[PDB]
Amino acid sequence: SMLQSNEYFSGKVKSIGFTSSSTGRASVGVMAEGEYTFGTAEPEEMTVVSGALKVLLPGTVEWKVYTAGEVFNVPGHSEFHLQVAEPASYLCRYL
Amino acid sequence: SMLQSNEYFSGKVKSIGFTSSSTGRASVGVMAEGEYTFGTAEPEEMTVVSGALKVLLPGTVEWKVYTAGEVFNVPGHSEFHLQVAEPASYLCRYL
Numbered sequence: 001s002m003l004q005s006n007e008y009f010s011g012k013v014k015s016i017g018f019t020s021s022s023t024g025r026a027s028v029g030v031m032a033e034g035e036y037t038f039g040t041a042e043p044e045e046m047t048v049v050s051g052a053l054k055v056l057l058p059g060t061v062e063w064k065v066y067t068a069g070e071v072f073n074v075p076g077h078s079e080f081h082l083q084v085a086e087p088a089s090y091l092c093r094y095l
Numbered sequence: 096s097m098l099q100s101n102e103y104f105s106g107k108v109k110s111i112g113f114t115s116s117s118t119g120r121a122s123v124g125v126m127a128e129g130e131y132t133f134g135t136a137e138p139e140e141m142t143v144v145s146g147a148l149k150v151l152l153p154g155t156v157e158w159k160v161y162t163a164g165e166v167f168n169v170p171g172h173s174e175f176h177l178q179v180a181e182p183a184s185y186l187c188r189y190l
Contacts, residue, residue: 001182003109003125005100014098016109016125018182022163023145028123028184030098030111049144049186050118068117069164087096087113089123091144091184 009036015092025094031084042094043076051088056081104131110187120189126179137189138171146183151176 004017013036015029054065058078066072074080099112108131110124149160153173161167169175
């Protein structure tokens, strides 16, 4: 099981993919200051590890800020939007 | 501020380095199943993000297991040892 390096948005988002019994398939990553839209295949459970992610989720027109230790879910076959004021790290589980 | 990709032990440990006001200089990473010794320059504060790290710290002869959300410190200019039973992710702050 190789640890999978991922990069998006010309290196403004980077992640490391892995699988473990306690997470299932997952990644940890960092988003630099910026604004991003990500499409989803599998549904995702995002846990903020450090910093803050301001997120616009499907089904809502309201942004919400998630800080360290907080969790949000994104449906599969969908997309979500982020504003990042300074680097923020996260754990993503692919459900 | 470029996100810094790091790899160690032929890809068995990978990390992403970043800096933010709430972390200082930091990295998030994953260790595959294995056993590792890392030297430190700056002192390190390690927070387990997922899984478990079994660690032998300077000044002790007994291993201790740290699980998700638990924190341990490693002195600077030193080293520490890890046993990893399956992939575990972490946040490291360089103090």
